[PDB]
């Protein structure tokens, strides 16, 4: 865990945010609010347990507790909800903006120091462990608070103060026809870990394209599967963390709730004497398995100890070259092992030495693995995956041992096999050409389950109670027309090459 | 789908592939960069000697192959026994 995330959005309640160079372009307030909607939807599906708030500045009215003028808070730091989405969308649009300007003011003098006070106080309100005091704001101009030198000085003083307090903030470039005026008033006063300010950005060219994009995932935090241990012989033991860099996600379980109250009704379940109508007890339980006629009775710890073979841990078997593993031999999704000094101190040194040595030897680690108590231990192989970096020196692959599992004899399922049949080499060349026609470079993040996407689409659609639900796009459908036009007549050429001209492959 | 060729037959193998959701990325510091945990050379040599003692394959003479000293893929699951 080690902290949580929270963002607060700041919108200039002025008239510059309520115009457009051309009607094809929305107002700054318009694309800001729609990007806010997209961000909130993403947070709900991704990390709904975070904190989000909305505050406005420059408006005529105000709502902050300290009651600084022009400082109207809209929403406080809370887990996002569809109600907030509705509150935002009631003013999102070419007329909802007018509704907002009617029921709410816009355009007045203020001090950025005041909004910084308000946001700092809002930070003070939250109490859970917190890690990312990210602040987001939206405008296309900087100099209005540089107009008053005293206002500029106090604003930059408070900005330095909040930077000292660990607060991090980010601004979106908005389309100002005369240029946002980078480097004039903000990047010297705002918090940046890097400098790319080169163009005063007459347009809104910054990272809205990423933010408006909707993501659909869960992004489970880095949680150690176990600090399980490797028993070398009987006493040489090291502490290593267990991880799964891939973990099959699935649709969240439903919650059974009422009809007219919609309340999730608790469901107590028990067992009673059917022959009597009385009541039975968990102690009054006996499991049976009848093979033919004889009935055999087993109990709780009776069924437990049959699963008992050894203590949960890793028991080294030996070493074998990596090549001696058949690729088609697969059991289930692989695991990953990372060292740790939390329990066994110096175990990281041993892990590094083993990784380097076995990488030199090109050998695999054979070991007996017991996940937890009362489980049959299974043999596994630890292939050393070296940490690989990129042009950005980011870990495209972390260091450690990828944990692949070794199937047993029962796993092997033989099938009715046939003889070996060969093919003419010219047909093989035709296949090579046809493959080259439709070849491409695979990338892992280029594909996704459309079924869960459609599930989400429906979920937020009924949440947003529109006329129609959003339609997900299947990225797993082949481009049949594109592939066919890309191949040409080679398809039918090989069809007559191999398949009989009179007999189609269809029966 | 990838091929699998035997002496008597050849066939393709299907392995289900994950989507973007199934994947997850976490930070993992390299130990070699952490010089506080750099093994000594003598320790490395002892490790290599143990590795040689842990070689569960034998380089066969008169036919250069690595025979398996412990084939587990042809071993049943003792839980049922």
């Amino acid at each position: 865990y080690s902290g949580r995330d929270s963002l607060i959005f700041l919108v200039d309640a002025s008239k510059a945010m309520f115009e457009s160079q051309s009607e094809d372009e929305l107002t700054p307030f318009d694309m800001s609010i729609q990007c806010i909607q997209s961000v909130y939807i993403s947070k709900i599906i991704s990390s709904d347990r975070d904190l989000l708030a909305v505050v406005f500045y420059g408006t005529e009215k105000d709502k902050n507790s300290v009651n600084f003028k022009n400082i109207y808070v809209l929403q406080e730091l809370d887990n996002p909800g569809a109600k907030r989405i509705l509150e935002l969308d009631q003013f999102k649009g070419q007329q909802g903006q007018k509704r907002f300007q009617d029921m709410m003011g816009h355009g007045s003098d203020y001090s950025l120091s005041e909004v910084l006070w308000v946001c700092a106080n809002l930070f003070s309100d939250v109490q859970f462990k917190m890690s990312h005091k990210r602040i987001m704001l939206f405008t296309n101009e900087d100099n209005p608070h540089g107009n008053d030198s005293a206002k500029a000085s106090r604003a930059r003083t408070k900005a330095g103060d909040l930077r000292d307090t660990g607060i991090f903030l980010d601004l979106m470039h908005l389309k100002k026809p005369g240029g946002f005026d980078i480097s004039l008033f903000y990047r010297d006063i705002i918090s940046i870990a890097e400098d790319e300010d080169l163009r005063v950005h007459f347009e809104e060219s910054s990272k809205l394209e990423d933010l408006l994009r909707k993501v659909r995932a869960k992004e489970t935090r880095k949680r150690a599967l176990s600090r399980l241990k490797l028993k070398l012989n009987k006493d040489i033991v090291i502490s290593v963390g267990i991880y799964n860099l891939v973990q099959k996600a699935l649709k969240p379980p439903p919650i059974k709730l009422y009809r007219e109250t919609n309340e999730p009704v608790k469901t107590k379940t028990r067992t009673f004497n059917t022959s009597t109508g009385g009541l039975l007890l968990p102690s009054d339980t006996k499991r049976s398995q009848i093979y033919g006629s004889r009935q055999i009775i087993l109990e709780k710890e009776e069924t437990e100890e049959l699963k008992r073979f050894d203590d949960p841990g890793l028991m080294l078997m030996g070493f074998k070259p990596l090549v001696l593993l058949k690729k088609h031999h697969y059991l289930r999704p692989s695991l990953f092992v990372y060292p740790e000094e939390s329990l066994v101190i110096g175990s990281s040194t041993l892990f590094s030495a083993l990784l380097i040595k076995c990488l030199e030897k090109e050998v695999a680690a054979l070991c007996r693995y017991t996940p937890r108590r009362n489980i049959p231990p299974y043999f596994v192989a630890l292939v050393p995956q070296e940490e690989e970096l990129d042009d950005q020196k980011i870990q495209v692959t972390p260091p450690g041992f990828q944990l692949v599992f070794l199937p047993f004899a029962d796993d092997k399922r033989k099938m009715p096999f046939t003889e070996k049949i060969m093919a003419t080499p010219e047909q093989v060349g035709k296949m090579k050409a046809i493959v080259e026609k439709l070849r491409f470079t695979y990338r892992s993040d280029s594909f996704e389950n459309p079924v869960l996407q459609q599930h989400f689409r429906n979920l937020e659609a009924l949440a947003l109670d529109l006329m129609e639900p959003e339609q997900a796009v299947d990225l797993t459908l082949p481009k049949v027309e594109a592939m066919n036009k890309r191949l040409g007549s080679l398809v039918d050429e090989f069809k007559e090459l191999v398949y009989p001209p009179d007999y189609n492959p269809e029966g | 789908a990838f091929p699998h060729i035997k002496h008597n037959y050849e066939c393709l193998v299907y392995v289900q592939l994950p989507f973007m959701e199934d994947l997850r990325q976490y930070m993992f510091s390299s130990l070699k960069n952490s010089k506080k945990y750099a093994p000594t050379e003598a320790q490395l040599n002892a490790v290599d000697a143990l590795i040689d003692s842990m070689s569960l394959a034998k380089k066969d003479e008169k036919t250069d192959t690595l025979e398996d000293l412990f084939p587990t893929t042809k071993i049943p699951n003792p839980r049922f026994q």
């Binding site: 995330d5 990390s47 990423d210 994009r213 993501v215 992004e219 491409f440 990225l475 481009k479 | -």
Partner: peptide
């Protein structure tokens, strides 16, 4: 941090859908 999803801290910024090109 470069190569990081701003919307989702501490995580890779996914590349959008690309499909396949013809060369």
């Amino acid at each position: 941090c470069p190569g990081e999803s701003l919307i989702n801290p501490g995580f890779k910024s996914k590349k959008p859908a690309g499909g396949v090109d013809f060369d």
